[PDB]
Amino acid sequence: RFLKVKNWETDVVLTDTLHLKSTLETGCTEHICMGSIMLPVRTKDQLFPLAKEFLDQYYSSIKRFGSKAHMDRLEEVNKEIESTSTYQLKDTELIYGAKHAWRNASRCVGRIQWSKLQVFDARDCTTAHGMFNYICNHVKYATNKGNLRSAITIFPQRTDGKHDFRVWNSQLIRYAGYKQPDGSTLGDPANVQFTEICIQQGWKAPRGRFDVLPLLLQANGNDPELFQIPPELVLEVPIRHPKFDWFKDLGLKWYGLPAVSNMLLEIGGLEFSACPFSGWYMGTEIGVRDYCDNSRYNILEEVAKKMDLDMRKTSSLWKDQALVEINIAVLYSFQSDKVTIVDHHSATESFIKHMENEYRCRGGCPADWVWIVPPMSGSITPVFHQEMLNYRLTPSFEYQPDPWNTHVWKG
Amino acid sequence: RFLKVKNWETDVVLTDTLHLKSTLETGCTEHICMGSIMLPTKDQLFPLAKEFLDQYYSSIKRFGSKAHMDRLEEVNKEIESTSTYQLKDTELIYGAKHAWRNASRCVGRIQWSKLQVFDARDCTTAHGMFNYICNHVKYATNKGNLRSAITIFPQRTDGKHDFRVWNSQLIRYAGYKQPDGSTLGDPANVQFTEICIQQGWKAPRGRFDVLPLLLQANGNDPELFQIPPELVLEVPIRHPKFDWFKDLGLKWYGLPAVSNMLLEIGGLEFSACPFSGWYMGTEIGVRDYCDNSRYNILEEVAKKMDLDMRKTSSLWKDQALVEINIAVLYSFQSDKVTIVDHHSATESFIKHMENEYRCRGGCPADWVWIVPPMSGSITPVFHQEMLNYRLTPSFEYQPDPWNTHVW
Ligand code: HEM
Ligand code: HEM
Ligand SMILES: CC(C)(C)ONC(=N)/N=C/CC[C@H](N)C(=O)O
Ligand SMILES: CC(C)(C)ONC(=N)/N=C/CC[C@H](N)C(=O)O
Ligand SMILES: C[C@H](O)[C@H](O)[C@H]1CNc2nc(N)[nH]c(=O)c2N1
Ligand SMILES: C[C@H](O)[C@H](O)[C@H]1CNc2nc(N)[nH]c(=O)c2N1
Ligand SMILES: [Zn+2]
């Protein structure tokens, strides 16, 4: 079966055959579309087919399908599964797998870069202090003094589900949030619960508006331990505006390295529950979502006030005006400090070229429109006008429950 | 089978049960989501009529009453005898209001119960269609105080006597390709404009020419008619702070009136059912003005503002976009023509969704269409999970009649 997608701006039609290789479910049926829903211990039984599927994919990628080397590796993995009930990936397969999980990540607009990912193998790690050291190294390598380099660090895979490696932080670098007794929040409201955990674990909080959170790291199913990332390793950018000189007096800054640390990487049926990965920011992530969501720093009012916009009626589009100015400031600030950032026009234009390339060479590109379209100026970006098909390919990044909801405390 | 939708800004969770009555299919499967794709007999008819009459009698609290049974009996008799049936006025009005209520792509549905339904099932000629349409235009326009309306022409019979309005909206601007290679007027309408010219329209060959109506009665060849200019309320576009903005010479029409969809009620198909409400500002200022394949005016506006257009990261497009949209709203408001901004409309839709969840058990909604085409995440609909499913009565797409019609 072939499926066609059309761009309604250009009339370019593309044909998808890659969706035939999709195995996992979407959440949708013939009777309900769940496309806007945010979120819609294995036996040998299920493990060998998943491993075989993966190694067939790997050996095809390297022009070695059906080779002696291919056959010997299936045999070796099969015996390892029946003998030990799991298996170990070769380094080459781990690299291939991690790059493909990114290539397959349908919510990711940055995937033109997928083949340039630095994979750090941390599968020899055994303790939280060991995890801390690997994570400092990733941050320093990825940051590269502002010339950001995409990277992933991969800790040991799940075994019995009782010995999991987890990074409890949702990102390696994030700011603390504090709920005040009057009901207001200081800092980032998204991180209040996590910040309360850290404090309970013994972090002494500076209690300001941009406190970089400590790492909370669980090795081998043990209780997590706290570590402060060396401040000299945390690159930050003070936010100012090219024309408005009062903008700096808002006291805003943000960190340069966006590093997702709470997802699960699945490769060939193996589950890597700690696999922090990092790229670089698209400006709207900070300027639209982190600053202007009502449930985040919520700075629209204060900015619009300073601009003396007409705030008595929404139809003045005061929020829209302030929104654009904030986003100019974020891009200006990062570019001026020589910290890698991409604007939403450049990023979406690149994605469309990536997507067309993938259709030609791969037969498809799964993509989640809801996530790919930027949270401001949607229809003046080419992706708004592009029909996409969303389906799930493995290797993949997957959500997993927050570890505080499932952890068995040792004491 | 019982489904939750969460708002991520407010944490409010709603439970959807209404989807279980979903009839038509979505295009999606368990393997693939098609959420962003724009267009994914006697024995057939009786269950459809029954399903509809059942929800109708339920709505007037008369389910299982004799009057309910008797109507079902009568229609069954009528289908058996005539192969079709005729809706009572009460059913027709209920059906059209509900087709709007069920429109998953419509952010304006808080208004769904206030719909003036004009029964045109007695219409027989293109001239009668023109008459009904002028009356709808004048009624809905109401000197700028717009009122929602639908006009319903006769239902499909054997399918070779279809009533159709060939136009995609009652009021739109012409488009002409030039020797230049550029396009004058609205490029969306270039093809329909050619069809009009080939049918005999003398086009005045300008940027904002109101197109003539091309009306097909009774499967006959369609015919041209000019809407009385005095019935077409238009708005010149100026800006509350930029004096040069009026120099661009932009205008738009006050009445958005979709005229190419098919209304399905109780299995009956109404192939000509033009309907109208009023504009949300972004439809004109973001889509009609700034789409690359529409009037595409961002470049000209940015220049006049003297923005740095050397690099995408200055956000010059985004800046001009906001200004264009301020100017659309200001202009309609100044001229006392109903318009709604995207903040107000989306806020209303959230309130409507809650009402529907509470009173009906859900609200089919298509997030891809509901979230405005600018400033998505600063509107509350961005953060609201929505379930998309197909309920009937419904408005459906149908093929353009020039691809179907036999001359
Ligand atoms: C290279 C620079 C990159 C840019 C500009 C980029 C851009 C983005 C953006 C804007 C989102 C949506 C984020 C949000 O709204 O929270 C995203 C999601 C995602 N990206 Fe990329 N990305 C990049 C690199 C990567 C890398 C290196 C990986 C993994 C190796 C990755 C995997 C994903 C995944 C798994 C998601 C979905 C996360 C979720 O569901 O919350 N990205 N990316
Ligand atoms: C009262 C004022 C109304 C407002 C502000 C409103 C708002 C909108 C908006 C912004 C769209 C998306 C249009 C587009 O992007 O092309 C839409 C689509 C839709 N609306 Fe409403 N609407 C209103 C009245 C109505 C009425 C009176 C009906 C039917 C009786 C209706 C049925 C629909 C349908 C069927 C669509 C989807 C059409 C398509 O797929 O192209 N609307 N509406
Ligand atoms: C971590 C990752 C995906 C590799 O980098 N990509 C990226 N630009 N952003 C991902 C999430 C960042 C999040 N939106 C934030 O604003 O902190
Ligand atoms: C009833 C009706 C016609 C849907 O009104 N709704 C509306 N505000 N617009 C719908 C389509 C109009 C189209 N987006 C336009 O910008 O011309
Ligand atoms: C409910 C809805 O799916 C949710 O708000 C999504 C919308 N699209 C998004 N897109 C991106 N990139 N990131 C997000 O957090 C979201 N949030
Ligand atoms: C490809 C994509 O589905 C298409 O561009 C849609 C996106 N969302 C939309 N939303 C509305 N309200 N109107 C539209 O025309 C579209 N176009
Ligand atoms: Zn779907």
mmCIF file of N, CA and C in Angstrom, chain A residues 232-277:
data_model
loop_
_atom_site.group_PDB
_atom_site.id
_atom_site.type_symbol
_atom_site.label_atom_id
_atom_site.label_comp_id
_atom_site.label_asym_id
_atom_site.label_seq_id
_atom_site.Cartn_x
_atom_site.Cartn_y
_atom_site.Cartn_z
ATOM 1 N N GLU A 232 30.658 26.426 36.315
ATOM 2 C CA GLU A 232 31.483 26.776 35.156
ATOM 3 C C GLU A 232 31.100 25.958 33.906
ATOM 4 N N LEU A 233 30.345 24.867 34.081
ATOM 5 C CA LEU A 233 29.934 24.014 32.973
ATOM 6 C C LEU A 233 28.535 24.389 32.420
ATOM 7 N N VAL A 234 27.806 25.218 33.157
ATOM 8 C CA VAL A 234 26.433 25.621 32.798
ATOM 9 C C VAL A 234 26.459 26.961 32.063
ATOM 10 N N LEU A 235 26.417 26.917 30.727
ATOM 11 C CA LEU A 235 26.440 28.124 29.927
ATOM 12 C C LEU A 235 25.047 28.724 29.968
ATOM 13 N N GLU A 236 24.995 30.009 30.316
ATOM 14 C CA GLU A 236 23.752 30.782 30.355
ATOM 15 C C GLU A 236 23.864 32.068 29.557
ATOM 16 N N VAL A 237 22.710 32.551 29.076
ATOM 17 C CA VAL A 237 22.630 33.759 28.267
ATOM 18 C C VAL A 237 21.649 34.767 28.909
ATOM 19 N N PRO A 238 22.150 35.959 29.317
ATOM 20 C CA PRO A 238 21.305 37.056 29.810
ATOM 21 C C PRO A 238 20.470 37.575 28.637
ATOM 22 N N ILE A 239 19.175 37.779 28.857
ATOM 23 C CA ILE A 239 18.324 38.151 27.738
ATOM 24 C C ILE A 239 18.162 39.669 27.663
ATOM 25 N N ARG A 240 18.511 40.202 26.496
ATOM 26 C CA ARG A 240 18.312 41.615 26.164
ATOM 27 C C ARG A 240 17.700 41.787 24.752
ATOM 28 N N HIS A 241 17.228 42.996 24.463
ATOM 29 C CA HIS A 241 16.569 43.279 23.191
ATOM 30 C C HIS A 241 17.393 44.249 22.372
ATOM 31 N N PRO A 242 17.425 44.080 21.027
ATOM 32 C CA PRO A 242 18.279 44.959 20.188
ATOM 33 C C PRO A 242 17.860 46.436 20.148
ATOM 34 N N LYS A 243 16.584 46.715 20.376
ATOM 35 C CA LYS A 243 16.089 48.083 20.370
ATOM 36 C C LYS A 243 15.586 48.551 21.723
ATOM 37 N N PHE A 244 15.024 47.662 22.533
ATOM 38 C CA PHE A 244 14.451 48.093 23.814
ATOM 39 C C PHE A 244 15.465 47.917 24.939
ATOM 40 N N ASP A 245 15.999 49.022 25.439
ATOM 41 C CA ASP A 245 17.040 48.924 26.432
ATOM 42 C C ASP A 245 16.537 48.573 27.846
ATOM 43 N N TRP A 246 15.242 48.723 28.109
ATOM 44 C CA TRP A 246 14.674 48.281 29.400
ATOM 45 C C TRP A 246 14.483 46.772 29.498
ATOM 46 N N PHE A 247 14.672 46.067 28.379
ATOM 47 C CA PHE A 247 14.394 44.619 28.366
ATOM 48 C C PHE A 247 15.331 43.870 29.310
ATOM 49 N N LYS A 248 16.582 44.333 29.401
ATOM 50 C CA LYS A 248 17.585 43.673 30.239
ATOM 51 C C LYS A 248 17.178 43.754 31.697
ATOM 52 N N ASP A 249 16.478 44.824 32.064
ATOM 53 C CA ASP A 249 16.082 45.025 33.444
ATOM 54 C C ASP A 249 14.934 44.143 33.900
ATOM 55 N N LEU A 250 14.387 43.349 32.983
ATOM 56 C CA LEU A 250 13.480 42.270 33.365
ATOM 57 C C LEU A 250 14.203 41.146 34.147
ATOM 58 N N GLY A 251 15.532 41.117 34.069
ATOM 59 C CA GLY A 251 16.331 40.159 34.820
ATOM 60 C C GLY A 251 16.265 38.760 34.229
ATOM 61 N N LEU A 252 15.908 38.645 32.956
ATOM 62 C CA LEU A 252 15.782 37.316 32.351
ATOM 63 C C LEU A 252 17.116 36.749 31.882
ATOM 64 N N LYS A 253 17.275 35.445 32.079
ATOM 65 C CA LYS A 253 18.314 34.688 31.392
ATOM 66 C C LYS A 253 17.790 33.300 31.044
ATOM 67 N N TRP A 254 18.515 32.543 30.214
ATOM 68 C CA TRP A 254 18.186 31.112 30.055
ATOM 69 C C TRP A 254 19.453 30.316 29.847
ATOM 70 N N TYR A 255 19.384 28.985 29.916
ATOM 71 C CA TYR A 255 20.567 28.187 29.742
ATOM 72 C C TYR A 255 20.677 27.839 28.252
ATOM 73 N N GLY A 256 21.884 27.560 27.778
ATOM 74 C CA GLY A 256 22.088 27.276 26.364
ATOM 75 C C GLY A 256 21.820 25.847 25.927
ATOM 76 N N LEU A 257 21.928 24.881 26.846
ATOM 77 C CA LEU A 257 21.925 23.461 26.467
ATOM 78 C C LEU A 257 20.614 22.768 26.878
ATOM 79 N N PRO A 258 19.733 22.501 25.902
ATOM 80 C CA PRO A 258 18.507 21.772 26.182
ATOM 81 C C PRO A 258 18.823 20.284 26.172
ATOM 82 N N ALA A 259 18.642 19.625 27.311
ATOM 83 C CA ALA A 259 19.113 18.234 27.410
ATOM 84 C C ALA A 259 18.062 17.312 28.045
ATOM 85 N N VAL A 260 17.205 16.716 27.213
ATOM 86 C CA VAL A 260 16.090 15.861 27.713
ATOM 87 C C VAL A 260 16.636 14.610 28.434
ATOM 88 N N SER A 261 16.260 14.388 29.690
ATOM 89 C CA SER A 261 16.866 13.301 30.469
ATOM 90 C C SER A 261 15.888 12.263 31.070
ATOM 91 N N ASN A 262 14.633 12.326 30.661
ATOM 92 C CA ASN A 262 13.607 11.458 31.248
ATOM 93 C C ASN A 262 12.933 10.455 30.308
ATOM 94 N N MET A 263 13.456 10.321 29.081
ATOM 95 C CA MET A 263 12.887 9.405 28.103
ATOM 96 C C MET A 263 13.561 8.033 28.102
ATOM 97 N N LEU A 264 12.900 7.043 27.498
ATOM 98 C CA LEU A 264 13.448 5.685 27.394
ATOM 99 C C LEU A 264 13.799 5.422 25.949
ATOM 100 N N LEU A 265 14.995 4.918 25.737
ATOM 101 C CA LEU A 265 15.468 4.567 24.402
ATOM 102 C C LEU A 265 15.269 3.068 24.203
ATOM 103 N N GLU A 266 14.476 2.686 23.201
ATOM 104 C CA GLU A 266 14.337 1.275 22.885
ATOM 105 C C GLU A 266 15.081 0.902 21.611
ATOM 106 N N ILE A 267 16.024 -0.038 21.727
ATOM 107 C CA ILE A 267 16.806 -0.553 20.582
ATOM 108 C C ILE A 267 16.743 -2.096 20.606
ATOM 109 N N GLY A 268 16.113 -2.694 19.602
ATOM 110 C CA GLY A 268 16.115 -4.158 19.441
ATOM 111 C C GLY A 268 15.488 -4.870 20.620
ATOM 112 N N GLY A 269 14.514 -4.208 21.232
ATOM 113 C CA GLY A 269 13.816 -4.751 22.386
ATOM 114 C C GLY A 269 14.458 -4.443 23.724
ATOM 115 N N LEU A 270 15.713 -3.993 23.722
ATOM 116 C CA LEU A 270 16.369 -3.557 24.945
ATOM 117 C C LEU A 270 15.906 -2.167 25.378
ATOM 118 N N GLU A 271 15.837 -1.957 26.682
ATOM 119 C CA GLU A 271 15.286 -0.716 27.232
ATOM 120 C C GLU A 271 16.334 0.073 28.024
ATOM 121 N N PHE A 272 16.739 1.222 27.469
ATOM 122 C CA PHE A 272 17.695 2.133 28.128
ATOM 123 C C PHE A 272 16.932 3.254 28.769
ATOM 124 N N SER A 273 16.669 3.073 30.068
ATOM 125 C CA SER A 273 15.866 3.987 30.837
ATOM 126 C C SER A 273 16.556 5.307 31.220
ATOM 127 N N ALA A 274 17.881 5.382 31.074
ATOM 128 C CA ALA A 274 18.624 6.642 31.302
ATOM 129 C C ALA A 274 19.439 6.861 30.064
ATOM 130 N N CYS A 275 19.098 7.890 29.294
ATOM 131 C CA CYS A 275 19.749 8.106 28.029
ATOM 132 C C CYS A 275 19.630 9.605 27.698
ATOM 133 N N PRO A 276 20.092 10.504 28.606
ATOM 134 C CA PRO A 276 20.066 11.962 28.284
ATOM 135 C C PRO A 276 20.622 12.338 26.895
ATOM 136 N N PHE A 277 19.881 13.164 26.146
ATOM 137 C CA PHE A 277 20.327 13.574 24.852
ATOM 138 C C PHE A 277 20.142 15.111 24.746
#
